[PDB]
Amino acid sequence: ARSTNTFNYATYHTLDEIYDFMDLLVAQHPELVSKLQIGRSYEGRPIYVLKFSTGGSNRPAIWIDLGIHSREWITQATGVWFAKKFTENYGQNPSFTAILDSMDIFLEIVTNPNGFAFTHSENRLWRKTRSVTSSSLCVGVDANRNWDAGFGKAGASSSPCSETYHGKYANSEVEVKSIVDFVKNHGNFKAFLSIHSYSQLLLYPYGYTTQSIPDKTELNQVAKSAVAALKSLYGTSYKYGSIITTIYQASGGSIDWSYNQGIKYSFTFELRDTGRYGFLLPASQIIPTAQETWLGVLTIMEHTVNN
Ligand SMILES: NC(=O)N[C@@H](Cc1ccccc1)C(=O)O
Numbered sequence: 001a002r003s004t005n006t007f008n009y010a011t012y013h014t015l016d017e018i019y020d021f022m023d024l025l026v027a028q029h030p031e032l033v034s035k036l037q038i039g040r041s042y043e044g045r046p047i048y049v050l051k052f053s054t055g056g057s058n059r060p061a062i063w064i065d066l067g068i069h070s071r072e073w074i075t076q077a078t079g080v081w082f083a084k085k086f087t088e089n090y091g092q093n094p095s096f097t098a099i100l101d102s103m104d105i106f107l108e109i110v111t112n113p114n115g116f117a118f119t120h121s122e123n124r125l126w127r128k129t130r131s132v133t134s135s136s137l138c139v140g141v142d143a144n145r146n147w148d149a150g151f152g153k154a155g156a157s158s159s160p161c162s163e164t165y166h167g168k169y170a171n172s173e174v175e176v177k178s179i180v181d182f183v184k185n186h187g188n189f190k191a192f193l194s195i196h197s198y199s200q201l202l203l204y205p206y207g208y209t210t211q212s213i214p215d216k217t218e219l220n221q222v223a224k225s226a227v228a229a230l231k232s233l234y235g236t237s238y239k240y241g242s243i244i245t246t247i248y249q250a251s252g253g254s255i256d257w258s259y260n261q262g263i264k265y266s267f268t269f270e271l272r273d274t275g276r277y278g279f280l281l282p283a284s285q286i287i288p289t290a291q292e293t294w295l296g297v298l299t300i301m302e303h304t305v306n307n
């Protein structure tokens with residue numbers, strides 16, 4: 001309510017509640033976290049990113065986004081928990097402290113604010129953005145089919161009414177371009193993590209082509225380690241591998257774009273579960289999901305620091 005220590009992390013929140021949370025966190029830890037507005041949504045809502053930094057100019061950074069697909073509520077809920085955990089473990093956990101003393105972490109909890117608000121007021125299963133385009137009565141674009149990586153190719157739909165519609169052209173969605181511009185301007189990101197649900201998978205590039213990435217051997221081992229770490233908590237089983245070999249051919253995905261930009265440690269997490277609840281995961285699983293996911297994320301971060 002009026003203190004991140006009183007905030008209920010075991011329940012799902014609205015857009016306003018999450019945004020308020022950000023202000024409270026920043027007010028409580030001014031020396032560690034700051035709120036940056038990287039753009040505005042199609043409908044004009046501000047797009048915020050939380051920057052966790054210990055100092056420095058343009059220290060190598062880790063990017064983490066959640067909620068690019070509005071209906072995957074477990075992701076924004078995990079992002080809120082992550083934000084609080086960062087402030088609790090710095091100075092207490094030797095590994096994480098080491099990470100923050102040398103790198104910055106950028107966390108975008110609500111990557112698709114228009115769609116998120118829509119899931120709360122009209123359609124709980126909305127997945128796309130909220131932009132409208134003349135030649136169609138259908139609304140929205142699949143933000144994770146809109147990136148400049150094999151755009152328009154197999155793995156995305158060309159019909160505006162489709163849940164996987166890629167849009168008119170790469171980066172047409174302001175929600176996507178806002179991230180692209182910020183990452184490009186920064187120029188020093190070392191890791192790029194995009195979180196989704198559901199399926200319990202840890203994926204690496206590529207999704208748009210069957211071509212194997214040059215760093216396949218290293219990324220596969222990093223994923224193997226992260227999955228083992230995540231499983232150690234509650235025994236949750238995750239599969240891992242390239243997007244195209246694990247799920248299916250998908251074009252215009254964020255991770256493929258970031259990897260092609262030279263950001264080697266690009267991974268997408270697909271959280272719980274494997275279909276029993278799907279997108280409607282019970283609130284009682286928020287904390288356990290967040291706790292185990294953190295172990296997998298920390299593993300990737302550790303590798304990035306020492307590499
Ligand atoms: N559940 C869910 O959203 N799955 C992802 C799969 C994916 C991951 C990374 C790149 C491309 C595609 C989707 O965007 O459809």
Ligand SMILES: [Zn+2]
Binds near residue numbers: 068072144
């Ligand atoms: Zn998704």
